[PDB]
Curated annotation (Swiss-Prot), chains G, H, I, J, K, L:
Its main location: periplasm. This is Putative serine protease HhoA. NCBIfam families: HhoA_HhoB_HtrA. Pfam families: PDZ_2, Trypsin_2. It comes from Synechocystis sp. (strain ATCC 27184 / PCC 6803 / Kazusa). The keyword Transmembrane helix does not apply. GO terms for molecular function: identical protein binding; serine-type endopeptidase activity. Keywords: Hydrolase, Periplasm, Protease, Signal. Disruption phenotype: No effect in a single knockout, but growth is inhibited at high light (120 umol photons/m(2)/s) or at elevated temperature in a triple protease knockout mutant (hhoA, hhoB and htrA). Triple mutants are not phototactic. No effect on the PSII repair cycle, even in the triple protease knockout strain. The gene is hhoA. One of its GO terms (biological process) is proteolysis. Belongs to the peptidase S1C family. A putative protease, its function overlaps that of the related putative proteases HhoB and HtrA.
Amino acid sequence: XXXXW
Amino acid sequence: XXXXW
Amino acid sequence: XXXXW
Amino acid sequence: XXXXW
Amino acid sequence: XXXXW
Amino acid sequence: XXXXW
Amino acid sequence: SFVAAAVSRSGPAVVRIDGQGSGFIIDNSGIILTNAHVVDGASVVVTLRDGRTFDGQVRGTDEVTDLAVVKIEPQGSALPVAPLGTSSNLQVGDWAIAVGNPVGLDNTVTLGIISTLGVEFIQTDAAINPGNSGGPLLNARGEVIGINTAIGIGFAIPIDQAKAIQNTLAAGGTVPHPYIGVQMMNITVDQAQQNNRNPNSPFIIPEVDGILVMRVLPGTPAERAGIRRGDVIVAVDGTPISDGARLQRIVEQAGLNKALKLDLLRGDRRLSLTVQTAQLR
Amino acid sequence: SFVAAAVSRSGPAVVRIDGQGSGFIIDNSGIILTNAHVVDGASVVVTLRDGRTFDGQVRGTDEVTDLAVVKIEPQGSALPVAPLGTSSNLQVGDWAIAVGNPVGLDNTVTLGIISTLGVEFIQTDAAINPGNSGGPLLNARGEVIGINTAIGIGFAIPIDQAKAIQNTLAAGGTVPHPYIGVQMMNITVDQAQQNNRNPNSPFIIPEVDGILVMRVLPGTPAERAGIRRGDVIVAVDGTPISDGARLQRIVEQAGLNKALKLDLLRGDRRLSLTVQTAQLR
Amino acid sequence: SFVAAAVSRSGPAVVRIDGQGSGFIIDNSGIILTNAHVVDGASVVVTLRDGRTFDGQVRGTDEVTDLAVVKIEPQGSALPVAPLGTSSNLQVGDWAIAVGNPVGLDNTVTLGIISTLGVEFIQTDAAINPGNSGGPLLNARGEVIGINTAIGIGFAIPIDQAKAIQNTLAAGGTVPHPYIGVQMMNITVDQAQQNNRNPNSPFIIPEVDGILVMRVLPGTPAERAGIRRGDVIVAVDGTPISDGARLQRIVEQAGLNKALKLDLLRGDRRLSLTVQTAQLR
Amino acid sequence: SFVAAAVSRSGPAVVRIDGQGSGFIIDNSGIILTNAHVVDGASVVVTLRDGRTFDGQVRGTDEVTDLAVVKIEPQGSALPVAPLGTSSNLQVGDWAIAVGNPVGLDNTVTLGIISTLGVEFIQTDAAINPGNSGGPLLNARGEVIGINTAIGIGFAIPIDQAKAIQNTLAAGGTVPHPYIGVQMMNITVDQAQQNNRNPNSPFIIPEVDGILVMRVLPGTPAERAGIRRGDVIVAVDGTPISDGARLQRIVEQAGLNKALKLDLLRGDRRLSLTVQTAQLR
Amino acid sequence: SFVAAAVSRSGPAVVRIDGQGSGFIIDNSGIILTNAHVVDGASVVVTLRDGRTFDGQVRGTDEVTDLAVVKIEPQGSALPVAPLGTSSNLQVGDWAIAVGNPVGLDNTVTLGIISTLGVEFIQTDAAINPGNSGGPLLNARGEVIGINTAIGIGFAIPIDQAKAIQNTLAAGGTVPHPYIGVQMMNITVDQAQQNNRNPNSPFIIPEVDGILVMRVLPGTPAERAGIRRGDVIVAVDGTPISDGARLQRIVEQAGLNKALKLDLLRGDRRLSLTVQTAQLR
Amino acid sequence: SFVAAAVSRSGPAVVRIDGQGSGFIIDNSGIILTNAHVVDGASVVVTLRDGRTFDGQVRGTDEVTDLAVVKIEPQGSALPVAPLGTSSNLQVGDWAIAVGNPVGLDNTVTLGIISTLGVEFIQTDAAINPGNSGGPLLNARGEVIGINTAIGIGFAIPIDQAKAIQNTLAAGGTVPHPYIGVQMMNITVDQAQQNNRNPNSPFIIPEVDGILVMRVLPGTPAERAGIRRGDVIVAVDGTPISDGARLQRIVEQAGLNKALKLDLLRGDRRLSLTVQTAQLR
Ligand code: NA
Ligand code: NA
Ligand SMILES: [Zn+2]
Ligand SMILES: [Zn+2]
């Protein structure tokens, strides 16, 4: 997963 | 607290 | 010298 | 500028 | 030389 | 030993 | 060399922007593309390859895409223009030419290939550095297909991407980047129940496959909606997800200030909250 | 100097042990105290201040107290003996003299005071180093009250402590150190519910004040009894605890291989398990 | 040990303040001295040596002297009080006892001497650390003569100094520290004309002996009065100076917001400006 | 781009192996080549470019050649196969294409040339990294000529090399690598007698040109045969040697457990010993 | 590969010079070009690609151009010769082939393009390293156009440059490099008066645009003529300058030991001095 | 404090020498002792505690003892003089007071004890630093017994040592320090034949106990006499030695330029050479 935001 | 063990 | 300030 | 020398 | 081994 | 010199 | 013909074609449009960095002129009006990180928030001096030092203002910026639109006033000789290509038909292994203008008189040029393709981002084994950041990445024919971005593999913002937000950054510089503020991770049952058997894991994941909220970012719609670390969003809408990439999409497909309900379980409890999408900044 | 009289009194009994380190002779039989970490598991050569190089064997070791008992065979001139004092009446601010024998002919001597008192451990602003580790820490009268331990504040194992396990390490070298394998922490409601309001805390603590299991050590009675990180042991026996120091005691008061039930809650669930105390190693 | 009697006398008044640090109670009202840097701007919990955890507020702070006055409410048993001595009669070589309370139950105590004397600042070879910072430095009789300040030589704010600004920090916490914002240096003709013969010195000093303005600090009365780097203040008032220490004095003897004319030459030009003294912050 | 046609030809056979790394399928049976260091001794999951996640076992490993043979079970669509070329006719300056599969869906591709030739090892200025290690190195036509090995110059194990030990690592994974355990060096009279005139050289070399034993490795046939550092093997068999590379050969031409006599002189003494070749491990 | 034909053409002339480095043979007489920094002042052994180890002497050196001319004696087989091209017609984007001989038997070869053009210096994205330093940089046809110089962008001394000083370094090795010893900088009014408004700038620049003497180098014609740091040379001859690059030229156009008057102002004073050009060393 | 009386007694004689460092006045003539490393070869300005800035010249230096004799001219008030004690009767554990003058007006004073005794060198747990280097180390009565030397244990050159070479450094500054240039080591049969069984030891020691020449220093009488590394001097004169400390003595007992024969064996060969003692420099 990455997420980021 | 310490714990240790 | 020191100055400082 | 460069200078050098 | 190398050796190695 | 020390040596030195 | 075929690259010489490409550099001869787009090279005269590649300018210096002064912290430093490169850019390139999009049309004779004086519209120049560069990296947003080339422009430290201010609004710079543009030097063309011929030595002409115009004076440019920063008409837009997208921080999250890292690209700006600078403007200069056409006077005297015609402003050289780099021909835009399209990045939607790029092949992995096609030639890539990174052109910069580090001083404002020459063009520094490196050669490589399209190392990988995201559409989303471009990789290349063409040497990309501060010397050409903001400058164009060309194909074998000399039309720009990317925008070099310095941080042996380099990155370039696709040109079809910049096309999209051009007019916006040309005008009022705010691009819609909806978000919620959750650093998520892909979780697997065989990672979950495997986690749940490590005595020193932070929290037991409630089995299943999904997106494990790894972090809630401070002052975000996800903090405000009461989302916690360790939570597992199972379904948005009714759409089951286990991808952390896929969720980033549906947010964006929803507007700004768009309420999205979130079915998630907190260890044992079933929990549904609605975040409202804010603008990433 | 009053310290000169102290060094003259215990100094000739302070020996070199060879990684390196110091030790001191406890009686004319050839019983020598030192740090366990001076003895790298093997069983060394002892040099007295007069130059006599005896040959010593390591008859015991306590790793967790970090102290060994070495033996040498009395021959020729009488083995000098350092007089043992008692550490149970030490005052914070009493003179402390750290004597070592780094070469085996002289005594290096530093002077300080009792910097703090644990009984449990001694602190001193007397310079303690590899040069005197295992050597004695004396009072103003020149009787040993500690055993220097190198790691401006130094540490010394109290002498009443070594007295306790002397005969044991003199004979079969295994001292009873019961344990369970849990790195705990003192938790407070006002730390707990305060934790429970940070969106990015690992696990919600179930309110209360207590011992928050911070870690379960691999291959320990606590891992074997199914204890997890994040657990909260509320009562052992029926005895409510919130101290991580206090729990270390009751374990020791129980024997080795002594079943101790543990009332603990896992988030919401009430959970009682019995660990069986093993020997720390 | 004579220090034991000193620790027994002032030690029970030495408290823990919780980033961390020590302090000591000045009278039964609950007035406690510490370092300003022990108090990170907020207004903390005070633990006495007996275990009593009062709740303290920070009634004052002097950042430039680095000392605060904390207040606690006397209840139950009488608050222990450390007797104040006077630092105006200190001798270089007198015993110095640094007492801290790092945990809130014991007192950690180090011993040294008065290493040097500024009145202005105290140096000591007594081990001074985070464990005793804010705590008192005592003489052989056990009355406080300084306030330990952590940053083998340690520093202590003299006690006569804290006495001066006690009532102020007890009440409204702003101490008069007039200043102008000039980092000066003592210059000598034989340093000046010696400078003036180095081809790569920044600026030629106009011969003479004096205070060479080395730097003008941003947003200061000296920047506002048009003082530049390289300037040489020859006379204030009519008083010729070549000391950078001496000038610091006359500023302070003048009030706050006190206009002081400055005769200075800028290379060749004679120049007189009036700075107005501001409050160091 | 000619590389695009090469990537289109071998690229679909390039797989992800999961520490991480790449590999490539040798035939439709499910035989995959990679680096031994991609396989941390265990026996991994294989992802094809199309997303198909098979499950692979490690049927062999050669640590000293650093290459493994993984096996997957063909099911559904035909396993894509990369066509093997031959490395025996490589020219220095021929195009080199390094293909990896770092994620399991795309192919990352870098372009370079054959930087140098050992047969023994391949060098290339094609960017070789963890992203393509174990993956294939192709020629302009798209047939594999090497196996990328990460450690601007990269290395690749020649493909003719892997061909040799394929069946072996396909079956029982032990390749004959005879050795004796001696780190040797080429010595020259004009290095020897030149050594012998430096007063601070370790040992005088007995003049001559040869292989100076620089080190005897612990637990090796050379330690067991009584070979020492500083020794000079003059003749094996009757074959005079001064090359440290050449000796490595004759060992290998002899079997495993093959007694080889060694004429060597120890300073002055003539000395003949027989080492028996062991398997490098 | 087209590079293979280029390496086949000039490669056999590329030799090893042994600190280490490469070189290449200019004609059958045994004239070899390399970097001056390959030759640590001494006068080395040359190994050809075929293994022939001649013995070379260093007949010249230019330190400031960093290039030497080595000589070997032709014997037996004809010395292979690399064909010289011309660097005066190089295009940015033309292929560049860096050939070295790191061992003396093979040729290590990297491929890139002409990254930028100074005439003055050549940049290339061809990997340039210790392995090929002193070796030739070729065009697509295989004639040398530069001399690799190690210090992803590399540098090469243009070949037309080496041609110029060949005969000189072939004979008596001293090339005319006139100089005065002043590290200058381009100053702008809008940098000057902008400097003059920073209170903490070293010296006020006397407005104007020009060359600001930033440093006077020790033991130089500029120190001897009384030039100081902070000075501003306005006109040499009568020629107004603001370029630090341009001044470097007119010096060189003047001979060695050539008096050049210098109109410069020192803050306020107008000042004219004559430096006499010395030889850079 | 007893130290206050000591500082009051010798303190006024402790001066600043200006790289920096301290010194102390030996008699009213203006004879000052310090460290040779305080004097960077030049011949400094002396500031007394009262502020009087005399001007001193360096009349001698012993580099290997690290101590200088400076001279100042007595004028006006009587030069304060520090009373010399004797270091031949020092006891380990006697008080030690390190006095420096870092500024030239105060005396910085630290307190410790005699940590160990070489006669040869003094150790102390009194804080010794650049602030007091060259300054005196006093006993409880305030007479100098050493000279602080900065490099928690500090070192001091004994005062009886400086007494010896005072007149010499007062006059012509060359002290007899005979030497030969051999870094030796104590070797033991049980270290030797133990060495001789490690296959990777540099050279086999010829059994025995002795002084193993570990290194021959460049340009020394030992290099000139043909001594090599690995050699073993068995007997000088006829005197068997195994001590590397003891040999240093007999050299010194022999004059300068004093031929000393050396019976030594080189592996197998018996070898006798005569070195001639030079002056250490
Ligand atoms: Na002390
Ligand atoms: Na390329
Ligand atoms: Zn101390
Ligand atoms: Zn490249």
